[PDB]
Design a binder for this molecule. Structure first.
Ligand SMILES: Nc1ncnc2c1ncn2[C@@H]1O[C@H](COP(=O)(O)OP(=O)(O)OP(=O)(O)O)[C@@H](O)[C@H]1O
Ligand SMILES: [Cl-]
Ligand SMILES: [Cl-]
Ligand SMILES: [Zn+2]
Ligand SMILES: [Zn+2]
Lengths: 116, 301
């Protein structure tokens, strides 16, 4: 019945004013990509940076089990597009946000499904 | 002069043909630094330029390509080089990486421990090594051919590199091995490639292009390393980040290079010709299985 809440700990550490996790691996890319959130290859558009996924995963970086029951990682082995405005904290960004399952954009950072 | 717009500089053929004596390496642009794009790590930049240069060679690029990357960890606990390799390689390429120290990676499989503990059933299409020990920078001691992980790398190439495969092995003034240079002559072509972002360093990547599994050319590796240092000593390379800003042609083209299994008796001049042109890989195409030896010890008394 006891499990560590790494997600909540990082959120609280951030709120208290701690420095975001560093050394997320930022890719060189054209920045003319699709802008989708998580992709097999960097897809940053003009307003995003692309990072190696593993290095942006709280669970990967902290050496802890993934919340998946299979323990599978959403990010490892792929690339995550982060809004340039949020690129100072890619782990925080991927933790706090969710990907639209229809268009693949970040909800609230590219997803327009809920506007037509 | 247009060199500053290339990803790096490869050692010119005429320097490979000399018979120089080994000297100390004294780089004019030592301590100079290229201006990296905002927020880009040295190792991302360095690997990007390595891959950009490899894009100019006749690499075999089969379906279900197999790439193994040694020395892939960082004192940061992440694997920037692996992330560039995975970006560069066609989607689906099998990528294994390894390092002495723990790190989190985008590779499909990661093995932690000395490289000598790494074993694989299968053969590989490309081998990348960034293995290095900074303790070799000791300028107070003679600069002899080094063993250690270089002995592993030489055997790994001779035993587990597919015919037609390629390698890029990091060396420096003091981190080098004579047999590895000698093994360069077992490829259709070879060079020592220096990235423009790290040109103030005696680092280079020894690239063997399209493995033939037999000497095409007899190379004395003590002489060839002296030749490399001579080149570096007399050809200052201007630090440059330029090539990093144009990524439009970065991806390695999926050539679908053919893979066949063959026995040593079937490798004729026609096969060898295809191998040398990057149009054939010879290896089994079975499942890829790897392992790390673990030493078992009970320290209770
Ligand atoms: N025998 C070996 N087996 C496996 N990995 C090795 C071996 N020797 C060196 N390495 C690895 O090669 C890498 C060399 O990287 P680098 O050139 O940056 O040197 P470093 O100062 O040791 O490492 P870093 O500064 O990245 O932590 C390191 O990650 C190191 O652990
Ligand atoms: Cl951390
Ligand atoms: Cl020689
Ligand atoms: Zn993860
Ligand atoms: Zn959507």
């Amino acid at each position: 019945a006891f499990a560590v809440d790494a997600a909540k700990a990082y959120k609280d550490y951030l709120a208290s004013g701690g420095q975001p996790i560093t050394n997320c691996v930022k890719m060189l890319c054209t920045h003319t990509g699709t802008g989708q959130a998580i992709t097999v290859t960097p897809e940053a558009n003009m307003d995003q940076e692309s990072f190696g996924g593993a290095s942006c995963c709280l669970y990967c970086r902290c050496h802890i089990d993934h919340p998946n029951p299979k323990g599978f990682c959403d990010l490892k082995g792929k690339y995550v597009q982060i809004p340039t405005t949020c690129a100072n904290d890619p782990v925080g960004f991927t933790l706090k946000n969710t990907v639209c399952t229809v268009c693949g954009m970040w909800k609230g950072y590219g997803c327009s499904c809920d506007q037509l | 002069s247009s060199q500053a717009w290339q990803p790096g500089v490869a050692m010119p053929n005429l320097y490979k043909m000399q018979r120089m004596l080994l000297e100390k390496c004294d780089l004019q642009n030592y301590g100079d630094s290229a201006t990296l794009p905002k927020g880009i790590m040295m190792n991302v930049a360095k690997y990007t330029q390595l891959c950009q240069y490899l894009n100019t060679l006749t690499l075999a690029v089969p379906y279900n390509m197999r790439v193994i990357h040694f020395g892939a960890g960082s004192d940061k606990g992440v694997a920037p080089g692996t992330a560039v390799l995975r970006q560069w390689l066609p989607t689906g390429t099998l990528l294994v990486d390894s390092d002495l120290n723990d790190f989190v990676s985008d590779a499909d499989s990661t093995l932690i421990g000395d490289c000598a503990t790494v074993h694989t059933a299968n053969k590989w299409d490309l081998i990348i090594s960034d293995m290095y020990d900074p303790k070799t920078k000791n300028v107070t001691k003679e600069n002899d051919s080094k063993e250690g992980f270089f002995t592993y790398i030489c055997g790994f190439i001779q035993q587990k590199l597919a015919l037609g495969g390629s390698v890029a092995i990091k060396i420096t003034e003091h981190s080098w091995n004579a047999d590895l240079y000698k093994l360069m002559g077992h490829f259709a072509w070879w060079t020592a490639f220096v990235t423009n972002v790290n040109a103030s360093s005696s680092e280079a990547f020894l690239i063997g292009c399209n493995y033939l599994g037999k000497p095409r050319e007899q190379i004395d590796g003590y002489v060839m390393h002296a030749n490399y240092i001579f080149w570096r000593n007399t050809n200052p390379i201007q630090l440059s980040s330029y090539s990093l800003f144009d990524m439009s042609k970065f991806p390695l083209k999926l050539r679908g290079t053919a893979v066949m299994s063959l026995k040593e008796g079937q490798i004729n001049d026609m096969i060898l010709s295809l191998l040398s042109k990057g149009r054939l890989i010879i290896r089994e195409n079975n499942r890829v299985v790897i392992s790390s030896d673990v030493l078992v010890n009970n320290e209770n008394l």
